[PDB]
Design an enzyme around this catalytic site. Structure first.
Site, short mmCIF file in Angstrom:
data_model
loop_
_atom_site.label_atom_id
_atom_site.label_comp_id
_atom_site.label_asym_id
_atom_site.label_seq_id
_atom_site.Cartn_x
_atom_site.Cartn_y
_atom_site.Cartn_z
N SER A 23 0.79 -1.17 0.00
CA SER A 23 0.00 0.00 0.00
C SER A 23 0.86 1.27 0.00
CB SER A 23 -0.90 -0.03 1.20
OG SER A 23 -0.09 0.11 2.33
N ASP A 49 0.55 -6.67 -8.50
CA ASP A 49 -0.25 -5.48 -8.21
C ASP A 49 0.47 -4.18 -8.49
OD1 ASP A 49 -2.52 -7.00 -7.29
OD2 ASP A 49 -1.56 -7.14 -5.30
N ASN A 94 -5.79 -7.17 -8.78
CA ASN A 94 -6.37 -7.25 -7.44
C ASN A 94 -5.76 -6.19 -6.56
OD1 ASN A 94 -8.25 -8.27 -5.62
ND2 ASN A 94 -7.14 -10.19 -5.22
N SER A 170 -15.62 1.59 6.44
CA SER A 170 -14.37 1.67 5.63
C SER A 170 -13.75 3.07 5.71
CB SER A 170 -14.60 1.27 4.15
OG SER A 170 -13.39 1.36 3.36
N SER A 171 -12.43 3.10 5.75
CA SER A 171 -11.63 4.33 5.70
C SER A 171 -10.72 4.41 4.47
CB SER A 171 -10.76 4.43 6.97
OG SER A 171 -9.55 3.66 6.91
N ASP A 314 -3.71 -8.25 12.41
CA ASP A 314 -2.85 -9.09 11.56
C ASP A 314 -1.62 -9.59 12.31
OD1 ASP A 314 -4.77 -8.72 9.59
OD2 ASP A 314 -3.59 -7.25 8.49
N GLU A 342 -11.87 -13.72 4.95
CA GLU A 342 -12.26 -14.79 4.03
C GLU A 342 -12.58 -16.09 4.78
OE1 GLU A 342 -11.02 -13.25 0.85
OE2 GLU A 342 -12.16 -14.53 -0.50
N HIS A 386 -2.16 -16.66 3.81
CA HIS A 386 -0.74 -16.39 3.97
C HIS A 386 -0.29 -16.32 5.41
CE1 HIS A 386 -1.08 -11.68 3.89
NE2 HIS A 386 -2.28 -12.19 4.11
N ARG A 387 -1.12 -15.77 6.29
CA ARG A 387 -0.74 -15.53 7.68
C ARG A 387 -0.70 -16.77 8.50
NH1 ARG A 387 0.76 -10.47 7.56
NH2 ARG A 387 -0.67 -9.15 6.34
N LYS A 412 1.72 -14.62 -3.32
CA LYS A 412 1.19 -13.34 -3.83
C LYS A 412 1.49 -12.14 -2.91
CE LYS A 412 -2.15 -10.95 -4.75
NZ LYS A 412 -3.08 -9.95 -5.36
#
Length: 426
Positions: A23, A49, A94, A170-171, A314, A342, A386-387, A412
């Site tokens: 990001s 990405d 994505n 959302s922000s 996370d 997810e 992934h985590r 990814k």
């Protein structure tokens, strides 16, 4: 399909170089493209990405040079919004963190644009962004489903003034508005109705903007005051910070089994949210030293904690496997966010933790972990997450091997994870 088996690591010690965070790589690219002057971006993330962001910017007329196999980007700033003579379709794959900022910049640009991506992106709502951009006078139309990409954008001179917005839910959209608003011809007041989620996401954005010479006043996240007719100024050198969540795994390994580990890419002036992870390892007994562009951990015996980790969900996952090496019962509280991913990360972590022999108690929004005397050998299901794979890699710091199913679920988001781990394993 595939499994990876990691054998017992006697000691962790060395240096890890984190690649750029996704990001911040996107924000650095867009800002440098809008700025006046030549910016050299270093530690840029090399991934699919980011390559779509690079391609989108090339389409729009931005000149840059890649070097060091894509990790360095010298960008000649456009000195304002874009100008495309032909209709462009921009496909952003994505890349969620590129999508909203570009949509905003394209709404303020001259040209006609179609903004789309993979089916995964087409299920991510964009209605809050679109409503905020409509308050700036933007001309945007949904081509398929209301409140979802893909969108058609006819660029206009946007007019700021008062933008009233809802920051519960959302922000991500606010970030996009904050990036473009200083460049408009008018001043803008942004008013937030509720309590705003994801504050650190806003902090990162305002922090990178400040480094490119653009200031916004933040009134406790309830309103933002923006002077218009500002211009981003290029930086000689801008290094993209590594992802603080990615740092967590290597900091935990160093605390458990070090030795000394230094993670490069994140340092003392970072405002990323998961920087708070280091404080949890300190409360557990680890020794931490923040430096200019890195953090060092020194291994110590660890003691369990009982703490709220709502602010770092996370990286908190990393604490669940680190608890396997701590004395006492660790409790992680206020982590309902784990359940809305997810896959339900709370149950997923609990299920895999019991397989290595921990006693685990799951509530609505907490998890409590009591390590066994000796860990059991297990085949860890990773649930396409992934985590989960990265957290359970830490089991190999025991006397027991760990088998990780579907280890390519890291491909990814952090493809070199296991290779970096092996670099510090002795």
């Amino acid at each position: 399909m595939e499994q990876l088996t990691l054998n017992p690591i006697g000691k962790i010690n060395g240096e890890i170089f984190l690649p750029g965070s996704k990001s911040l790589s996107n924000r650095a690219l867009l800002i440098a493209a809008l700025a006046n002057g030549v910016t050299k971006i270093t530690n840029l993330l090399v991934s699919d990405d980011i390559n779509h962001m690079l391609n989108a910017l090339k389409s729009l007329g931005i000149e840059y040079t890649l070097s060091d196999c894509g990790t360095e980007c010298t960008v000649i700033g456009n000195g304002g919004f874009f100008n495309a003579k032909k209709p462009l379709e921009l496909y952003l794959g994505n890349a969620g963190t590129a999508m909203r900022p570009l949509c905003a910049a394209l709404a303020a640009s001259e040209g006609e644009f179609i903004l789309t991506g993979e089916p995964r992106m087409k299920e991510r709502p964009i209605g809050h962004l679109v409503d905020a951009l409509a308050q700036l006078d933007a001309d945007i139309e949904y081509l398929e489903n209301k409140d979802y990409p893909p969108v058609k954008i006819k660029g206009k001179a946007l007019t700021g003034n008062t933008v009233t917005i809802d920051g519960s839910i959302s922000s991500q959209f606010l970030t996009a508005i904050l990036m473009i608003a200083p460049l408009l011809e008018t001043n803008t007041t942004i008013e937030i109705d509720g309590e705003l989620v994801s504050k650190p996401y806003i902090d990162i954005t305002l922090d990178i903007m400040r480094r490119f010479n653009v200031s916004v006043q933040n009134n406790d996240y309830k309103s933002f005051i923006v002077n218009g007719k500002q211009s981003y100024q290029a930086l000689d050198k801008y290094m993209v910070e590594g992802d603080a969540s990615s740092a967590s795994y290597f900091l935990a390994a160093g605390a458990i089994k070090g030795g000394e580990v230094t993670v490069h890419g994140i340092g003392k002036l970072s405002v990323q949210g998961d920087k708070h992870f280091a404080d949890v390892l300190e409360k557990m007994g680890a020794e931490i030293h923040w430096k200019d562009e890195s953090i060092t951990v020194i291994g110590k015996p660890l003691t369990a904690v009982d703490m709220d980790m709502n602010h770092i969900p996370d990286a908190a996952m990393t604490i669940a496997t680190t608890a396997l090496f701590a004395t006492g019962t660790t409790t992680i509280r206020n982590i309902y966010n784990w359940r809305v991913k997810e896959t339900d990360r709370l149950n997923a972590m609990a299920t895999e933790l019991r397989k290595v022999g921990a006693e685990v108690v799951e509530g609505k929004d907490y998890i409590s972990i009591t390590p066994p005397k000796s860990l059991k050998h297990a085949e860890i299901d990773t649930y396409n997450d992934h985590r989960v794979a990265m957290c359970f890699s830490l089991v190999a710091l025991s006397d027991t091997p760990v088998t990780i199913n579907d280890p390519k679920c890291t491909a990814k988001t952090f493809p070199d994870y296991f290779d970096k781990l092996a670099q510090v394993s002795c």
